[PDB]
């Protein structure tokens, strides 16, 4: 079963016209039934090898515009399967279709699929999702639209850990410290402070305040404090109360 799907992919790229145009679109459909099978119906070795050949054909400029969008629908339904080694390879297919390609509207649905794998999904999986999504949002759509989805899905009660979600917010602002948008960094700090007055638990609520002003601060020394801050997530201390005061007052002289 594995060697026979490998020579089907070598015909569509290099030798299209010698076989029918009806034959190209029907090898795409047979990898829908197999990749949306269960974790025992199609094995892990058969799963990972037919899927790597699907993002090959898209980067080749040979497929038609109707033949390419059939691959877009199958990759959405497999990110929300439970096995993360099965579900790590399905995240690679969502990129390339967006990397070969209403324009504002349909891109709303793909971005919120990445944010749920943080919520549901193992910590061996969600280390991958927090390195991309800093770099991922800066490229597609402007930062006025990227800012609404992050914090409202950072502050939520159904966030299993903000620990790996803490590294996402840090790398956004320091690319927004380009000279054109460094002052627009300042306006978004004001609205998020109103959300804390409606409270999380009292040990938990004050920890999230200290991680935010670090990422919007001066250059040389405040920015290096954040792995020391996200080290201790809970466990309030007399040493913990003194650290919150120093961070949000340098921002008062940053305005």
Please provide the DSSP assignment of 160-227 as one string: S-SHHHHHHHHHHHTTTTSTTTTTHHHHHHHHHHHTTTS---HHHHHHHHHHHHHHSS-STTTGGGHH
What is the DSSP code (8-state) at residue 238?
H
What is the DSSP code (8-state) at residue 134?
H
CB-count burial class (<10 Å; 0-12, 13-18, 19+) for 71: buried
Q: Yes or no: say if 225 and 214 are a contact pair by the CB < 8 Å rule.
A: yes
Which H or E run contains 77?
none
d(CA 37, CA 3): 19
Q: Give me the helix-helix angle, 143-151 and 103-119, nearest 10°.
A: 30
Contacts of 71 (CB under 8 A, 6+ apart): 28, 54, 58, 93, 97
d(CA 89, CA 51): 8
- The encoded tokens of residue 91 equal 């995240």
Which H or E run contains 131?
helix 129-140
Q: Is the dihedral of CA 190, 192, 197, 203 positive or negative?
A: negative
- The encoded tokens of residue 229 equal 């801050």
What is the four-CA torsion angle of 204, 208, 210, 212, rounded to 10 degrees? 180
Contacts of 170 (CB under 8 A, 6+ apart): 134, 211, 214, 215, 226
Contacts of 211 (CB under 8 A, 6+ apart): 166, 169, 170, 226, 229, 230
Q: Report the 10 Å Cβ neighbour count for 213.
A: 21
d(CA 171, CA 195): 22
Q: Yes or no: say if 159 and 119 are a contact pair by the CB < 8 Å rule.
A: yes
| Residue of 162, 145, 144 lying closest to 153 (CA atoms) | 162
Please provide the size of the chain in residues: 255
The single residue listed with the structure tokens 């749920």 is 116
CB-count burial class (<10 Å; 0-12, 13-18, 19+) for 53: middle
């Amino acid at each position: 079963v594995l060697v026979m799907c490998a020579t089907a992919f070598y015909l569509i790229e290099n030798y299209p016209l010698d076989v029918g145009p009806e034959f190209s679109a029907s090898i795409i459909q047979m990898c829908g039934v197999m990749l949306s099978g269960s974790e025992e119906s199609t094995p892990s070795i058969i799963y990972h090898c037919a899927l790597r050949g699907l993002e090959r054909l898209l980067l080749s400029e040979q497929l038609s515009r109707l033949d390419a969008e059939s691959l877009v629908k199958l990759s959405v339904d497999r990110v929300n399967v439970h096995s993360p080694h099965r579900a790590m390879a399905a995240l690679g297919l969502m990129l390339t279709c967006m990397y070969t390609g209403e324009s504002v509207i349909v891109a709303m649905e793909r971005v919120s699929v990445l944010f749920d794998r943080i919520r549901k999904g193992f910590p061996c999986e969600a280390r991958v999702v927090a390195r991309i999504l800093p770099q991922f949002l800066d490229d597609f759509f402007p930062p006025q639209d990227i800012m609404n989805k992050v914090i409202g899905e950072f502050l939520s009660n159904q966030q299993p850990y903000p620990q790996f979600m803490a590294t996402v917010v840090y790398k956004v602002f320091q690319t927004l410290h380009s000279t054109g948008q460094s002052s627009m960094v300042r306006d978004w700090v004001m609205l998020s402070l109103s959300n804390f007055t409606q409270r999380a638990p009292v040990a938990m609520a004050t920890w999230s305040l200290s991680c935010f002003f670090v990422s919007a601060s001066t250059s040389p020394w405040v920015a290096a404090i954040l792995p020391h801050v996200i080290s201790r997530m809970g466990k309030l201390e007399q040493v913990d109360v003194n650290l919150f005061c120093l961070v949000a007052t340098d921002f008062y002289r940053h305005q």
